[PDB]
Design a binder for these strands. Structure first.
Lengths: 136, 57, 62, 189, 74, 52, 74, 60, 51
RNA sequence: GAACGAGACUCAAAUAUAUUAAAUAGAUAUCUUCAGGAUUAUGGUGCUGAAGCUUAUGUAUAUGUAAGUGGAGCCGUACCUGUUGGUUUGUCCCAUUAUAAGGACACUAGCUUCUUAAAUGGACAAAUUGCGUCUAGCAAUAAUGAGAUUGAGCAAUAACAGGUCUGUGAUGCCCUUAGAUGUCCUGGGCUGCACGCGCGCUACAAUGAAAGUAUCAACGUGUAUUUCCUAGACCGAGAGGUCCGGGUAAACCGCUGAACCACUUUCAUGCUUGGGAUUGUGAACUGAAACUGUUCACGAUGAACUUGGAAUUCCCAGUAAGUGUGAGUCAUUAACUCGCAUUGAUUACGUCCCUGCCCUUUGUACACACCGCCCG
């Protein structure tokens, strides 16, 4: 049966809740397509259920544990951004704060004038491979 | 060699010893017209003969 | 239409190699009126084909 | 006997197209359960003329790079496709395909003299051992384009059209491009 | 041992067809000589042949065994 | 000593070609170090008949 | 263009219409599930699990990515 | 597909006209075996090419 | 194959087959190296383990 | 009598293991924990406190289980399966530390099919209604493991202004060396990128994709001032860490028990978990030392691509193509090439159109040879 929600909404995006949550709830920006099943079975929800169910009485647990990953039994190497090292907090930024200090991290790369951040400014392919014919 | 190395290198580590020799006997004794060799690794000592046209050289 | 067509001979690959190996098709009701077609397709003796047009003769046998 | 290939029968099927039998010793003298003969079918000019209609389309779905080199996966599809044919009017796929390929082959006329200044001088007859040599191929092309993107999967789509190609125009799966070239080749001769 | 999956499946079907020609010819029966293979000259089911096909060697200059990469401007 | 650089026991340069001192053409599949271009005619006589 | 306005939706508000079905159904797969609209394939894995009454229905075999049903007709 | 025995098989094919007219007959496997003593074939598997010809020689 | 390998890529092969045959024994100590240097000839070195 | 080239020969492998035959590989029998078949045969026997489980627990884990409990089980034997290990000159032994020989006995109580090529073994077609001409009735598919296992190595005459002086202690002459081009001392570069071009890799998914679950390779490589193949524990989300073991190799990895393919579930064909380009942070590894980078995983990002214009490649059978693995250089890094196995089609079974190459006949005013010569 499916007559319940047909839509969802969390912080920073509206979840298009049509698909099954094993492939659906990674549409939040900052969550890997295996990181959902890492969190959701720790979030005590049945993964075989589609996203027409799993409304707010199941979303209530999943929202704060993104803000508190370390207090919810996930190790810090299985997190997105540990080793900041600025403030030392092993974070996981998501969909607003992913891009908030994205430019601020390479702002230091313009303060320290390093060629990694200069390649960000000049425009290349992301890493240091050959620019004889990639160069676009 | 006091090493227990197996047959896939024994026939070439002592095996290129005859080809590195083959121009060394050409170069050092070139006064004779050095023709060829015959080596025989016997127990406790090895001997190699050298054929030439000028043999009291 | 489905007018019967049995074969007599398979030839060299004329048609400038479309392997259009021509033939001298024999029919059922007669044995003497029967005459050439230039078919496409490899043929053994005994290929009982059925042809549409019995009016084309294609008179450039090689 | 050695009928009942998986489920039904290998006998009780003989259409006498007049006089377009004397085709192939198909399986009345060549009883089988699965078509997996191993390797040797390209050794003489005519080895597959002593070999059934039902061999070649099993291996005939092996194209497009990531789908060739898989025959026993392809025989799985077509064996399970064969009871879709038991679900369409409950007719066995022997007189579904052999009644297809009478009409699923381009009849007699195809257009090739293309090494000349034009192309239009064309074949008087097509040999029936080359009718079936691509009549099995026309339905493979219709099998991919039906099951390409979103429509309906490979297991039902080729069996969707074998009795629909038992006679004429349903759509342009393959029935058109069996009738496309035949009217051209008499518009050219 | 050896081969892949269906190589051995093509071999274990050979196995007892290898045996009834090698174990009916000593004590059992000589009706079991000729109707061994009247069943299998109607078929032969590639069962009494030492199949000579084998993976042919790869030659130089290309990736295939009998196929060498080109289109290099001519 | 001082400025006596490159402890060359990483990478082939320069533990290479005791026979002919050719750097970038080394062959090592039995441990020979013999300039493989020279090896094409040194193969006789070190066995190495082309049987096929 | 079958862009299929669709949420992956269980919808037992059409399961009283999921016995409109079997007259005159004959070829029911999750791929010919496109006959009914609101076409699914993954909740339509679930949608014919309880279509196995062995009465008014018949299947051949369940298989990975291969499901085929029909009517047990007269 | 040579349709005659092609290369230099008259090393034996015209020495058996008078020097070995007899000492053989129409059997192909007999004169398979008589060739080994009449000439020192140094690598043998040339032998049946210069033995198998007598099936065409004595018939002609 | 070619030195300074510019042009018409070609390859060569260097086969060298080492063959060996094994013969058993259960015998006293020195009765086999009474056949020490016969028949010795270049290419073969014969190993015998008395254990 | 010409002679070389081509044939012929040489290799792999198909092929008879008849013969020679075993650290290995083994078929075979034998023996090693009733191996469930009281659903092939059978006994002490079962509702009668038995197996099982409760309590206190006896090294401040033997945990039997009698007692609590339980309602019926514990115990006998086997044709078949399933076994440590031992029967390759044996069953007892003589002898020997023990094996072999010595005896009886089988009087072979593990042999040569496979693994292993040692040597031999193996295609010639007699016959094809037409006086194809008293010479090729090649319709004998047959016959047959085989019409070659058929793939390869060698490769003449003639030369090119093909490539290499930066393969070398092959080298002319040239050049520079007390102001070195050498030799290098350090680092950078060969990886610089608005662009053109080349061979490739990965994909553009629902024959698929995803997590499990079934299970088979072959070619071979394998450490010795050691830095390699690797077993088996330990510690680790993983990368990787500690401590020991085997293999100089048919012995150990290793039944090299590889990968798609097989099955089941999860995704429904959404530019979506198709696809992984890009990119931040951490965790690591070798190199003294790692940055338009030396590689390797973890979370995160999810670019183009929905099959590719003009054109243009490779190939006729275990081939193409799919899928792996070995080896090469290798401290570390393979998308590369040299091998190898595995899955295994289509479509010819042929012509000279296309583009080349040969043969002559023929034209020529060309002969640095039609990229010619050459006219106003």
């Amino acid at each position: 049966p499916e007559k319940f929600q047909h839509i969802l909404r969390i912080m920073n995006t509206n979840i298009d809740g049509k698909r099954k949550v094993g492939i659906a709830m990674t549409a939040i920006k900052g969550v890997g397509r295996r990181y959902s099943n890492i969190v959701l079975k720790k979030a005590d929800v049945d993964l075989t259920k589609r996203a027409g169910e799993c409304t707010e009485e199941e979303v209530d647990k999943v929202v704060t544990i993104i803000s508190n990953p370390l207090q919810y039994k996930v190790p810090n190497w299985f997190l997105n951004r540990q080793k900041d090292i600025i403030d030392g907090k092993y974070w996981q930024l998501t969909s607003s704060n992913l891009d908030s200090k994205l430019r601020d991290d390479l702002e230091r790369l313009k303060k320290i004038r390093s060629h990694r951040g200069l390649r960000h400014y000049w425009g290349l392919r992301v890493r240091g491979q050959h620019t004889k014919t990639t160069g676009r | 060699a006091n090493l227990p190395i197996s047959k896939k290198r024994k026939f070439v580590s002592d095996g290129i010893f005859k080809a590195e020799l083959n121009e060394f006997l050409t170069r050092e004794l070139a006064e004779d017209g050095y023709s060829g060799v015959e080596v025989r690794v016997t127990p406790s000592r090895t001997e190699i003969i050298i054929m030439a046209t000028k043999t009291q050289q | 239409p489905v007018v019967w067509a049995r074969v007599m001979k398979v030839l060299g690959r004329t048609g400038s190699q479309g392997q259009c190996t021509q033939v001298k098709v024999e029919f059922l009701g007669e044995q003497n009126r029967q005459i050439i077609r230039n078919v496409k397709g490899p043929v053994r003796e005994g290929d009982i084909l059925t042809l549409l047009e019995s009016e084309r003769e294609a008179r450039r046998l090689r | 006997e050695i009928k009942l290939f998986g489920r039904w029968a290998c006998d009780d099927i003989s259409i006498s197209d007049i006089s377009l039998q004397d085709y192939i010793a198909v399986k009345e003298k060549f009883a089988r359960y699965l078509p997996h003969s191993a390797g040797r079918y390209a050794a003489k000019r005519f080895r597959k003329a002593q070999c059934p209609i039902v061999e070649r389309l099993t291996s005939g779905l092996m194209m497009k790079g990531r789908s060739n080199g898989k025959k026993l996966l392809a025989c799985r599809i077509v064996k399970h496709a064969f009871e879709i044919i038991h679900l369409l009017t409950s007719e066995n796929p022997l007189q579904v395909t052999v009644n297809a390929i009478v009409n699923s082959g381009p009849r007699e006329d195809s257009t090739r003299i293309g090494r000349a200044g034009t192309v239009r001088r064309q074949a008087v007859d097509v040999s029936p051992l080359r009718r079936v040599n691509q009549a099995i191929w026309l339905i493979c092309t219709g099998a991919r384009e039906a099951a390409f993107r979103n429509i309906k999967t490979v297991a039902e789509c080729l069996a969707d059209e074998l009795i629909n190609a038992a006679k004429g125009s349903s759509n342009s799966y393959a029935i058109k491009k069996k009738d496309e070239l035949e009217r051209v080749a008499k518009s050219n001769r | 041992s050896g081969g892949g999956h269906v190589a051995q499946i093509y071999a274990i079907r050979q196995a007892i067809s290898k045996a009834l020609v090698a174990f009916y010819q000593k004590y059992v029966d000589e009706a079991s000589k000729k109707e061994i293979k009247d069943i299998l000259v109607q078929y032969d089911r590639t069962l009494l042949v030492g199949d000579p096909r084998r993976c042919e060697p790869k030659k130089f200059g290309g990736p295939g065994a009998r196929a060498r990469y080109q289109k290099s401007y001519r | 000593t001082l400025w006596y650089s490159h402890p060359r026991k990483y990478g082939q340069g320069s533990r290479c070609c005791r026979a002919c001192s050719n750097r970038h053409g080394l062959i090592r599949k039995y441990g020979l170090n013999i300039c493989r271009q020279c090896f094409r005619e040194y193969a006789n006589d070190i066995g190495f008949k082309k049987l096929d | 263009r079958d862009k299929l306005n669709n949420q992956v939706l269980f919808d037992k508000a059409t399961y009283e219409k999921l016995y409109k079905e079997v007259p005159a159904y004959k070829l029911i797969t999750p791929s010919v599930v496109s006959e009914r609209l609101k076409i699914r394939g993954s909740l339509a894995k679930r949608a014919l699990i309880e279509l196995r009454e062995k009465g008014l229905i018949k299947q051949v075999v369940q298989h990975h990515s291969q499901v085929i049903y029909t009517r047990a007709t007269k | 597909m040579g349709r005659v025995r092609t290369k230099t098989v008259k090393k034996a094919a015209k020495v058996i006209i008078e020097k070995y007219y007899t000492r053989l007959t129409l059997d192909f496997h007999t004169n398979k075996r008589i060739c080994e003593e009449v000439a020192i074939i140094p690598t043998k598997p040339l032998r049946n090419k210069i033995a198998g010809y007598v099936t065409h020689l004595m018939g002609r | 194959k070619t030195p300074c390998g510019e042009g018409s890529k070609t390859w060569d092969r260097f086969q060298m087959r080492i063959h060996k045959r094994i013969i058993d024994l259960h015998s006293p100590s020195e009765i086999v190296k009474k056949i020490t240097s016969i028949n010795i000839e270049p290419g073969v070195e014969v190993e015998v383990t008395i254990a």
